[PDB]
Short mmCIF file of C-alpha atoms in Angstrom, two decimals:
data_model
loop_
_atom_site.label_atom_id
_atom_site.label_comp_id
_atom_site.label_asym_id
_atom_site.label_seq_id
_atom_site.Cartn_x
_atom_site.Cartn_y
_atom_site.Cartn_z
CA UNK A 4 0.00 0.00 0.00
CA UNK A 5 0.97 3.65 -0.41
CA UNK A 6 0.54 6.88 1.54
CA UNK A 7 -0.80 10.27 0.47
CA UNK A 8 0.77 12.09 3.44
CA UNK A 9 2.82 14.96 2.11
CA UNK A 10 5.78 14.63 4.44
CA UNK A 11 5.91 10.94 3.60
CA UNK A 12 6.14 12.16 0.02
CA UNK A 13 8.96 14.45 1.16
CA UNK A 14 10.86 11.51 2.63
CA UNK A 15 10.17 9.50 -0.53
CA UNK A 16 11.67 12.22 -2.72
CA UNK A 17 15.23 10.91 -2.49
CA UNK A 18 16.39 13.18 -5.32
CA UNK A 19 17.13 15.96 -2.83
CA UNK A 20 19.08 13.64 -0.54
CA UNK A 21 22.76 14.10 0.19
CA UNK A 22 23.55 10.85 -1.65
CA UNK A 23 22.93 12.54 -5.00
CA UNK A 24 25.43 15.24 -4.01
CA UNK A 25 28.33 12.77 -3.99
CA UNK A 26 27.63 10.31 -6.80
CA UNK A 27 27.74 13.09 -9.38
CA UNK A 28 30.53 15.40 -10.44
CA UNK A 29 28.29 18.46 -10.11
CA UNK A 30 25.36 19.38 -7.92
CA UNK A 31 23.28 22.13 -6.45
CA UNK A 32 25.21 24.38 -4.08
CA UNK A 33 22.35 26.12 -2.29
CA UNK A 34 19.36 24.78 -0.37
CA UNK A 35 16.03 26.48 0.16
CA UNK A 36 14.91 24.06 2.87
CA UNK A 37 11.39 22.74 3.21
CA UNK A 38 8.35 23.15 5.44
CA UNK A 39 8.63 20.11 7.69
CA UNK A 40 5.40 18.86 9.23
CA UNK A 41 5.07 16.39 12.06
CA UNK A 42 1.31 15.88 11.83
CA UNK A 43 -0.18 12.47 10.94
CA UNK A 44 3.26 10.87 11.28
CA UNK A 45 5.10 8.86 13.86
CA UNK A 46 6.77 12.10 14.98
CA UNK A 47 4.21 14.18 16.87
CA UNK A 48 4.67 16.02 20.09
CA UNK A 49 1.72 17.68 21.74
CA UNK A 50 2.89 21.28 21.67
CA UNK A 51 5.26 21.97 18.79
CA UNK A 52 4.17 20.00 15.74
CA UNK A 53 6.66 21.62 13.37
CA UNK A 54 10.12 20.72 14.68
CA UNK A 55 12.37 18.05 13.31
CA UNK A 56 12.87 15.33 15.95
CA UNK A 57 15.92 14.89 18.13
CA UNK A 58 18.31 12.05 18.96
CA UNK A 59 19.76 12.15 22.46
CA UNK A 60 22.38 9.37 22.46
CA UNK A 61 24.02 6.39 20.84
CA UNK A 62 26.07 3.88 22.83
CA UNK A 63 28.15 1.65 20.44
CA UNK A 64 27.49 -1.83 21.79
CA UNK A 65 30.70 -3.87 21.51
CA UNK A 66 31.70 -7.37 22.61
CA UNK A 67 35.28 -8.56 22.83
CA UNK A 68 35.15 -12.13 21.41
CA UNK A 69 38.07 -14.23 22.74
CA UNK A 70 40.01 -17.07 21.17
CA UNK A 71 39.80 -20.19 23.42
CA UNK A 72 43.15 -21.35 22.04
CA UNK A 73 46.06 -18.95 22.32
CA UNK A 74 48.04 -20.91 24.85
CA UNK A 75 48.70 -22.87 21.67
CA UNK A 76 50.09 -19.67 20.15
CA UNK A 77 53.84 -19.95 20.04
CA UNK A 78 55.78 -17.50 17.92
CA UNK A 79 58.26 -18.21 15.18
CA UNK A 80 60.19 -15.30 13.73
CA UNK A 81 59.24 -15.27 10.00
CA UNK A 82 62.21 -16.91 8.32
CA UNK A 83 62.16 -19.94 6.06
CA UNK A 84 59.04 -21.75 4.99
CA UNK A 85 59.51 -25.51 5.24
CA UNK A 86 59.54 -27.22 8.62
CA UNK A 87 59.19 -30.91 9.37
CA UNK A 88 59.71 -33.60 11.96
CA UNK A 89 60.26 -37.33 11.88
CA UNK A 90 60.30 -40.53 13.89
CA UNK A 91 62.10 -43.85 13.76
CA UNK A 92 59.86 -46.86 13.24
CA UNK A 93 59.86 -49.89 15.47
CA UNK A 94 61.91 -53.03 14.98
CA UNK A 95 60.61 -56.14 16.70
CA UNK A 96 63.64 -58.28 17.61
CA UNK A 97 64.37 -61.69 16.14
CA UNK A 98 65.32 -65.13 17.43
CA UNK A 99 68.86 -66.48 17.26
CA UNK A 100 68.84 -69.02 14.43
CA UNK A 101 72.55 -69.87 14.54
CA UNK A 102 72.36 -72.06 11.43
CA UNK A 103 72.76 -68.96 9.27
CA UNK A 104 76.25 -68.22 7.99
CA UNK A 105 78.47 -65.97 10.06
CA UNK A 106 79.21 -63.28 7.46
CA UNK A 107 75.82 -61.61 7.84
CA UNK A 108 77.33 -59.56 10.67
CA UNK A 109 79.21 -57.73 7.94
CA UNK A 110 75.90 -56.90 6.26
CA UNK A 111 74.22 -53.74 7.45
CA UNK A 112 70.83 -52.51 8.65
CA UNK A 113 70.07 -48.81 8.51
CA UNK A 114 67.35 -47.47 10.82
CA UNK A 115 64.11 -46.45 9.20
CA UNK A 116 62.51 -43.05 9.27
CA UNK A 117 59.13 -41.44 8.72
CA UNK A 118 59.02 -37.70 8.21
CA UNK A 119 56.18 -35.30 7.60
CA UNK A 120 57.00 -32.18 5.60
CA UNK A 121 54.59 -29.31 6.20
CA UNK A 122 55.38 -26.14 4.30
CA UNK A 123 54.34 -22.51 4.55
CA UNK A 124 51.59 -20.91 6.57
CA UNK A 125 49.26 -18.22 5.32
CA UNK A 126 49.05 -14.47 5.88
CA UNK A 127 45.74 -12.84 6.73
CA UNK A 128 44.89 -9.30 5.74
CA UNK A 129 42.02 -6.91 6.19
CA UNK A 130 41.37 -3.24 5.44
CA UNK A 131 39.14 -0.63 6.90
CA UNK A 132 38.50 2.93 5.83
CA UNK A 133 37.57 5.90 7.97
CA UNK A 134 35.95 8.63 5.89
CA UNK A 135 35.95 12.31 6.71
CA UNK A 136 32.96 13.38 4.58
CA UNK A 137 30.02 10.96 4.52
CA UNK A 138 30.44 9.45 7.96
CA UNK A 139 30.37 12.72 9.90
CA UNK A 140 26.94 13.61 8.58
CA UNK A 141 25.81 11.28 11.34
CA UNK A 142 27.26 11.49 14.90
CA UNK A 143 25.59 14.49 16.55
CA UNK A 144 28.72 14.92 18.68
CA UNK A 145 32.34 14.28 17.80
CA UNK A 146 32.70 12.03 20.85
CA UNK A 147 30.43 9.46 19.24
CA UNK A 148 32.61 9.57 16.12
CA UNK A 149 35.73 8.97 18.20
CA UNK A 150 34.08 6.07 20.03
CA UNK A 151 32.98 4.80 16.60
CA UNK A 152 36.51 4.84 15.22
CA UNK A 153 37.81 3.15 18.36
CA UNK A 154 35.11 0.49 18.43
CA UNK A 155 35.48 -0.50 14.80
CA UNK A 156 39.16 -1.12 15.53
CA UNK A 157 38.42 -3.15 18.65
CA UNK A 158 35.92 -5.34 16.86
CA UNK A 159 38.26 -5.72 13.91
CA UNK A 160 40.78 -7.15 16.30
CA UNK A 161 38.13 -9.39 17.87
CA UNK A 162 36.91 -10.87 14.60
CA UNK A 163 40.35 -12.29 13.84
CA UNK A 164 40.07 -14.20 17.12
CA UNK A 165 36.66 -15.66 16.35
CA UNK A 166 37.90 -16.36 12.81
CA UNK A 167 40.95 -18.40 13.76
CA UNK A 168 38.93 -20.17 16.45
CA UNK A 169 36.32 -21.42 14.02
CA UNK A 170 38.87 -22.36 11.42
CA UNK A 171 40.96 -24.27 13.96
CA UNK A 172 37.92 -26.33 14.85
CA UNK A 173 37.31 -26.59 11.10
CA UNK A 174 40.80 -27.95 10.51
CA UNK A 175 40.71 -30.60 13.15
CA UNK A 176 37.19 -31.75 12.29
CA UNK A 177 38.40 -31.97 8.68
CA UNK A 178 41.38 -33.99 9.87
CA UNK A 179 38.97 -36.09 11.91
CA UNK A 180 36.96 -36.95 8.84
CA UNK A 181 39.22 -37.07 5.78
CA UNK A 182 42.13 -38.59 7.71
CA UNK A 183 42.27 -41.00 10.67
CA UNK A 184 41.60 -43.91 8.46
CA UNK A 185 39.81 -46.98 9.76
CA UNK A 186 40.69 -48.20 13.25
CA UNK A 187 40.34 -45.15 15.39
CA UNK A 188 36.78 -44.33 14.49
CA UNK A 189 34.27 -45.81 16.91
CA UNK A 190 30.58 -46.03 16.15
CA UNK A 191 28.42 -44.97 19.06
CA UNK A 192 24.65 -45.33 19.01
CA UNK A 193 23.15 -42.68 21.29
CA UNK A 194 23.79 -39.43 23.11
CA UNK A 195 24.48 -41.42 26.27
CA UNK A 196 26.46 -44.17 24.51
CA UNK A 197 29.47 -42.07 23.52
CA UNK A 198 29.38 -40.61 27.02
CA UNK A 199 30.54 -44.04 28.11
CA UNK A 200 32.63 -44.62 25.00
CA UNK A 201 34.79 -41.54 25.56
CA UNK A 202 36.36 -42.92 28.72
CA UNK A 203 36.32 -46.21 27.03
CA UNK A 204 38.62 -44.40 24.61
CA UNK A 205 40.34 -42.63 27.46
CA UNK A 206 42.61 -45.36 28.93
CA UNK A 207 43.09 -46.61 25.41
CA UNK A 208 45.44 -43.67 24.99
CA UNK A 209 47.71 -45.14 27.61
CA UNK A 210 48.38 -48.62 26.36
CA UNK A 211 51.35 -49.06 24.07
CA UNK A 212 49.53 -49.22 20.75
CA UNK A 213 50.96 -49.25 17.27
CA UNK A 214 47.42 -48.20 16.32
CA UNK A 215 45.59 -44.95 17.24
CA UNK A 216 48.11 -42.77 15.41
CA UNK A 217 48.47 -41.75 11.79
CA UNK A 218 51.90 -42.98 10.82
CA UNK A 219 50.63 -44.84 7.75
CA UNK A 220 50.45 -41.60 5.70
CA UNK A 221 53.94 -40.32 6.56
CA UNK A 222 56.92 -40.39 4.20
CA UNK A 223 58.57 -43.68 5.10
CA UNK A 224 55.99 -45.02 7.53
CA UNK A 225 53.72 -46.54 4.91
CA UNK A 226 54.65 -50.09 5.92
CA UNK A 227 55.59 -50.66 9.54
CA UNK A 228 54.36 -49.84 13.00
CA UNK A 229 54.97 -47.16 15.59
CA UNK A 230 53.87 -47.16 19.23
CA UNK A 231 53.14 -44.08 21.35
CA UNK A 232 51.19 -43.45 24.55
CA UNK A 233 49.76 -40.36 26.22
CA UNK A 234 50.00 -38.90 29.70
CA UNK A 235 46.44 -37.57 30.59
CA UNK A 236 47.91 -34.17 31.33
CA UNK A 237 47.93 -33.80 27.56
CA UNK A 238 44.67 -35.21 26.17
CA UNK A 239 42.07 -32.83 24.73
CA UNK A 240 38.56 -34.01 23.95
CA UNK A 241 36.09 -31.97 21.97
CA UNK A 242 32.44 -32.23 21.14
CA UNK A 243 29.18 -30.38 20.91
CA UNK A 244 28.23 -28.37 23.97
CA UNK A 245 25.03 -30.43 24.28
CA UNK A 246 27.15 -33.49 25.01
CA UNK A 247 29.03 -31.86 27.87
CA UNK A 248 25.76 -30.45 29.15
CA UNK A 249 24.40 -33.99 29.21
CA UNK A 250 27.58 -35.01 31.03
CA UNK A 251 27.40 -32.21 33.61
CA UNK A 252 23.73 -32.69 34.43
CA UNK A 253 23.52 -36.47 34.19
CA UNK A 254 26.59 -38.51 34.96
CA UNK A 255 28.45 -36.36 37.46
CA UNK A 256 25.08 -35.52 38.99
CA UNK A 257 23.08 -38.73 39.27
CA UNK A 258 26.05 -40.88 40.31
CA UNK A 259 27.59 -41.02 43.74
CA UNK A 260 31.39 -41.47 43.63
CA UNK A 261 32.82 -38.72 41.43
CA UNK A 262 35.88 -37.97 43.56
CA UNK A 263 38.33 -39.15 40.93
CA UNK A 264 36.52 -40.25 37.79
CA UNK A 265 35.57 -36.82 36.41
CA UNK A 266 37.38 -36.13 33.13
CA UNK A 267 35.49 -32.88 32.56
CA UNK A 268 38.56 -30.62 32.80
CA UNK A 269 39.76 -31.80 29.39
CA UNK A 270 36.44 -31.17 27.62
CA UNK A 271 36.28 -28.24 25.29
CA UNK A 272 33.14 -27.89 23.23
CA UNK A 273 31.31 -25.78 20.71
CA UNK A 274 27.75 -24.78 19.92
CA UNK A 275 27.85 -26.27 16.44
CA UNK A 276 30.83 -27.91 14.78
CA UNK A 277 30.38 -26.45 11.34
CA UNK A 278 29.94 -23.09 9.67
CA UNK A 279 32.91 -23.75 7.52
CA UNK A 280 33.19 -24.82 3.92
CA UNK A 281 35.68 -26.53 1.65
CA UNK A 282 36.18 -26.00 -2.07
CA UNK A 283 35.91 -28.80 -4.57
CA UNK A 284 36.02 -28.80 -8.38
CA UNK A 285 37.93 -25.47 -8.67
CA UNK A 286 35.29 -23.10 -10.02
CA UNK A 287 35.49 -19.40 -10.88
CA UNK A 288 33.36 -16.37 -10.06
CA UNK A 289 30.71 -15.47 -12.62
CA UNK A 290 27.67 -13.83 -11.04
CA UNK A 291 27.26 -10.36 -9.60
CA UNK A 292 25.22 -11.19 -6.50
CA UNK A 293 27.82 -13.79 -5.49
CA UNK A 294 30.61 -11.27 -5.05
CA UNK A 295 28.06 -8.79 -3.69
CA UNK A 296 27.37 -11.35 -0.97
CA UNK A 297 31.13 -11.60 -0.56
CA UNK A 298 31.24 -7.83 -0.01
CA UNK A 299 28.99 -8.27 3.02
CA UNK A 300 31.77 -10.06 4.90
CA UNK A 301 34.80 -7.98 3.94
CA UNK A 302 35.88 -9.93 0.84
CA UNK A 303 36.54 -7.02 -1.51
CA UNK A 304 39.47 -8.26 -3.57
CA UNK A 305 37.66 -10.97 -5.52
CA UNK A 306 35.96 -10.02 -8.78
CA UNK A 307 34.12 -11.82 -11.54
CA UNK A 308 36.36 -14.31 -13.31
CA UNK A 309 38.67 -14.85 -10.35
CA UNK A 310 39.31 -18.53 -9.76
CA UNK A 311 39.11 -20.34 -6.45
CA UNK A 312 41.65 -23.09 -5.70
CA UNK A 313 40.43 -26.39 -4.27
CA UNK A 314 42.24 -26.00 -0.93
CA UNK A 315 40.50 -22.87 0.33
CA UNK A 316 37.95 -22.30 3.07
CA UNK A 317 35.08 -19.87 3.41
CA UNK A 318 34.24 -19.84 7.17
CA UNK A 319 30.61 -18.68 6.85
CA UNK A 320 27.41 -19.86 5.16
CA UNK A 321 28.23 -19.41 1.50
CA UNK A 322 27.05 -22.69 -0.02
CA UNK A 323 23.55 -21.29 -0.54
CA UNK A 324 24.91 -19.23 -3.43
CA UNK A 325 23.85 -20.59 -6.79
CA UNK A 326 27.42 -20.76 -8.07
CA UNK A 327 28.67 -22.98 -5.26
CA UNK A 328 26.18 -25.84 -4.97
CA UNK A 329 28.02 -29.06 -5.71
CA UNK A 330 31.33 -27.22 -5.64
CA UNK A 331 31.38 -26.41 -1.93
CA UNK A 332 31.07 -28.88 0.93
CA UNK A 333 30.50 -28.22 4.62
CA UNK A 334 33.04 -29.53 7.10
CA UNK A 335 30.59 -30.83 9.68
CA UNK A 336 29.96 -33.96 11.72
CA UNK A 337 27.35 -36.18 10.15
CA UNK A 338 24.86 -36.74 12.93
CA UNK A 339 25.29 -34.18 15.80
CA UNK A 340 26.92 -37.02 17.73
CA UNK A 341 30.60 -36.28 17.92
CA UNK A 342 33.53 -36.82 20.24
CA UNK A 343 37.01 -36.36 18.83
CA UNK A 344 39.73 -37.01 21.37
CA UNK A 345 43.45 -36.43 20.93
CA UNK A 346 46.42 -35.22 22.88
CA UNK A 347 47.90 -31.75 22.94
CA UNK A 348 51.32 -31.27 21.24
CA UNK A 349 49.76 -33.20 18.39
CA UNK A 350 48.35 -29.99 16.93
CA UNK A 351 50.78 -27.29 15.90
CA UNK A 352 49.59 -23.69 15.94
CA UNK A 353 52.18 -21.01 15.38
CA UNK A 354 51.63 -17.43 14.32
CA UNK A 355 53.66 -14.30 13.68
CA UNK A 356 52.07 -11.03 14.77
CA UNK A 357 55.08 -8.81 15.43
CA UNK A 358 54.75 -6.40 12.54
CA UNK A 359 50.99 -6.60 12.79
CA UNK A 360 49.59 -3.10 12.30
CA UNK A 361 50.77 -1.22 9.26
CA UNK A 362 51.14 2.55 8.99
CA UNK A 363 47.92 4.25 7.92
CA UNK A 364 47.41 5.40 4.36
CA UNK A 365 45.88 8.83 4.01
CA UNK A 366 43.98 9.43 0.76
CA UNK A 367 43.51 13.20 0.43
CA UNK A 368 41.80 13.07 -2.94
CA UNK A 369 38.78 11.52 -1.28
CA UNK A 370 39.85 12.34 2.33
CA UNK A 371 40.02 8.95 4.04
CA UNK A 372 42.37 7.04 6.29
CA UNK A 373 42.88 3.36 5.55
CA UNK A 374 44.33 0.79 7.94
CA UNK A 375 45.58 -2.70 7.18
CA UNK A 376 45.99 -5.68 9.49
CA UNK A 377 48.44 -8.48 8.61
CA UNK A 378 49.44 -11.60 10.50
CA UNK A 379 51.12 -14.84 9.47
CA UNK A 380 49.36 -17.86 10.93
CA UNK A 381 50.31 -21.51 10.56
CA UNK A 382 48.51 -24.58 11.81
CA UNK A 383 48.67 -28.30 11.19
CA UNK A 384 48.17 -31.69 12.81
CA UNK A 385 51.16 -33.75 13.61
CA UNK A 386 50.17 -37.30 12.68
CA UNK A 387 52.44 -39.01 15.20
CA UNK A 388 50.13 -39.09 18.21
CA UNK A 389 47.16 -41.04 19.47
CA UNK A 390 43.72 -39.91 18.29
CA UNK A 391 40.25 -41.47 18.44
CA UNK A 392 37.05 -40.32 16.76
CA UNK A 393 33.62 -41.34 18.02
CA UNK A 394 30.59 -40.62 15.82
CA UNK A 395 27.63 -42.38 14.22
CA UNK A 396 28.86 -43.71 10.89
CA UNK B 1 76.30 -10.15 9.86
CA UNK B 2 77.27 -7.64 7.20
CA UNK B 3 76.75 -4.15 8.54
CA UNK B 4 77.02 -1.37 5.96
CA UNK B 5 74.25 0.71 7.43
CA UNK B 6 71.33 -1.58 8.23
CA UNK B 7 69.14 1.37 9.23
CA UNK B 8 67.22 2.87 6.36
CA UNK B 9 63.68 4.16 6.48
CA UNK B 10 61.52 1.09 5.94
CA UNK B 11 62.31 -2.52 4.86
CA UNK B 12 65.81 -1.89 6.16
CA UNK B 13 64.11 -1.75 9.52
CA UNK B 14 61.30 -4.18 8.83
CA UNK B 15 63.19 -7.46 8.81
CA UNK B 16 63.77 -7.25 12.55
CA UNK B 17 61.01 -7.34 15.20
CA UNK B 18 59.15 -4.25 13.84
CA UNK B 19 57.03 -3.09 16.79
CA UNK B 20 55.38 -6.06 18.46
CA UNK B 21 52.05 -4.69 19.65
CA UNK B 22 48.34 -5.49 20.01
CA UNK B 23 48.45 -9.20 20.71
CA UNK B 24 45.42 -11.27 19.78
CA UNK B 25 43.73 -11.73 23.06
CA UNK B 26 42.50 -14.03 25.70
CA UNK B 27 42.81 -11.03 28.02
CA UNK B 28 39.11 -11.18 28.53
CA UNK B 29 38.81 -14.77 29.50
CA UNK B 30 37.18 -17.61 27.61
CA UNK B 31 36.60 -21.25 28.63
CA UNK B 32 37.40 -20.43 32.27
CA UNK B 33 35.09 -17.79 33.68
CA UNK B 34 33.19 -17.98 30.44
CA UNK B 35 31.93 -21.47 29.45
CA UNK B 36 31.50 -21.95 33.17
CA UNK B 37 28.35 -23.52 34.53
CA UNK B 38 30.31 -24.25 37.71
CA UNK B 39 28.66 -21.73 40.01
CA UNK B 40 28.33 -22.04 43.77
CA UNK B 41 25.46 -23.43 45.84
CA UNK B 42 23.59 -20.15 45.96
CA UNK B 43 21.47 -18.42 48.58
CA UNK B 44 19.39 -15.95 46.55
CA UNK B 45 19.33 -14.29 43.13
CA UNK B 46 20.79 -11.06 44.43
CA UNK B 47 21.72 -8.81 41.47
CA UNK B 48 23.41 -8.63 38.09
CA UNK B 49 25.55 -5.64 37.19
CA UNK B 50 23.84 -3.84 34.34
CA UNK B 51 26.69 -2.54 32.22
CA UNK B 52 26.14 0.52 30.04
CA UNK B 53 28.46 -0.01 27.09
CA UNK B 54 29.29 3.53 25.98
CA UNK B 55 32.30 2.91 23.72
CA UNK C 103 46.66 -9.25 -7.99
CA UNK C 104 47.19 -5.72 -9.26
CA UNK C 105 49.23 -3.34 -7.14
CA UNK C 106 46.70 -0.49 -7.34
CA UNK C 107 44.26 -2.53 -5.23
CA UNK C 108 45.30 -0.63 -2.09
CA UNK C 109 43.29 2.47 -3.04
CA UNK C 110 40.00 0.61 -2.83
CA UNK C 111 37.60 1.62 -0.10
CA UNK C 112 36.32 -0.86 2.50
CA UNK C 113 33.74 0.82 4.65
CA UNK C 114 32.59 -0.80 7.89
CA UNK C 115 28.98 -1.89 8.19
CA UNK C 116 26.67 -1.13 11.08
CA UNK C 117 23.24 -2.37 12.14
CA UNK C 118 20.82 -0.07 13.94
CA UNK C 119 17.48 0.04 15.72
CA UNK C 120 15.60 3.15 16.82
CA UNK C 121 13.55 3.67 19.98
CA UNK C 122 10.70 6.02 20.72
CA UNK C 123 9.93 8.07 23.79
CA UNK C 124 8.79 6.82 27.16
CA UNK C 125 5.70 7.59 29.20
CA UNK C 126 5.46 10.23 31.88
CA UNK C 127 3.13 9.04 34.61
CA UNK C 128 1.28 11.08 37.17
CA UNK C 129 -0.73 10.60 40.31
CA UNK C 130 -2.33 13.12 42.63
CA UNK C 131 -3.85 13.20 46.09
CA UNK C 132 -5.53 15.85 48.20
CA UNK C 133 -5.45 16.16 51.98
CA UNK C 134 -7.86 18.24 54.01
CA UNK C 135 -7.36 20.24 57.18
CA UNK C 136 -10.89 20.83 58.48
CA UNK C 137 -13.07 17.69 58.42
CA UNK C 138 -10.14 15.29 58.70
CA UNK C 139 -9.86 16.48 62.31
CA UNK C 140 -13.27 14.88 62.89
CA UNK C 141 -11.83 11.39 62.39
CA UNK C 142 -8.90 11.25 64.81
CA UNK C 143 -8.32 11.36 68.54
CA UNK C 144 -4.82 12.86 68.44
CA UNK C 145 -2.87 15.00 66.06
CA UNK C 146 -0.17 12.33 65.99
CA UNK C 147 -2.22 9.65 64.26
CA UNK C 148 -3.44 12.20 61.73
CA UNK C 149 0.19 12.91 60.91
CA UNK C 150 0.74 9.16 60.71
CA UNK C 151 -2.14 9.07 58.23
CA UNK C 152 -0.57 11.87 56.20
CA UNK C 153 2.76 10.08 56.03
#
């Protein structure tokens, strides 16, 4: 429906707005004003029905958004790109069959090795741009503009934290699914079943097992075995928060001897274990609304025709775009029934944030100030430690 | 090791530390005081500090 | 990518909601000095009534 109210027609006449005085290279330079009415609007007072309304305050609601990981954050010093480690595989000893000829003691036996070569990290970048012309047409005082410029900076150093948090949980759920081949998955059957099966799996960390690790995709550890235990000061279990809620209201509640058997200190959790996405099929960008949707999240640098490599991530709901269906797959657990247990010092997280802020760039020919943020993160999973998945497969 | 004059304006001074500042935080705490349903055996519902975020 | 990418503008986005006025509320009461005296046995309890 429409409205025949004349001041509603005044609001609807967007030709006299300030937006038309910046899109075009020329404009009007004088204003005659207009008779503003308040009557038959949502803007009446009782006494003075001819004044433009007033705003008394804004408050700039901001939340600080931590990391939940940065005791993992050790700092290399940005030199070199390839790092690796390695183990020696086991050799079961052999019986003394003395019938063999004595000159085999001249023949040699080199020890065997399995390495895992990692490679470079990745550098993350974002821009933001403080204007001096459009943005101060708001902000009835300058103090609100200063709090605005401070708060956009504080939230653009909080978003990097929530970003690397969700892509860490992305990376180890992806390692939980596409790696960790056949033995160390365990099929539960219910939301209480894996509650028992997790400390079934706890105390399987601490037997000397050639299983439970991921040596069989190393360099030289394709054929052979390798045994490693854990220490229980080192194990990290993760799951949905609903699972640890069911733990903390059911088993440590309705039982009676929980003086020692409570493993809940090593339980980190999340609300949902997927908002993240993985590229397949190596598409390109074709459609306008796709990159317009990318502009809503800060992704400015991609245009139409720009390719996407298969190893990238997208960290928010992007698969609903028409150009990504079939190409893009969500890293998520299958059944909302998830418990991935490992040990710490099996994940490697290592970032470089020393030269983090860059000097600001002042653009006088449109009067803005632009800031960049750079940091060099690296993360991987070392495959030489005991890990167990529990889902419904 | 070679000296010459290592100090020029930028990129002669960037390959060292280059102003470590503004660390990505757990200064406000997560998974400890946050993600904490481990509250005491209470006595009443006394109060909750209404914070006015102003900037 | 091209080196002139740095002079591209990335404005921050905000999300707002507006709020109207409140309500001023009023109540009145009237005390008397002449016939109120006909319903008390002291002046003290009449002052207790007034408070």
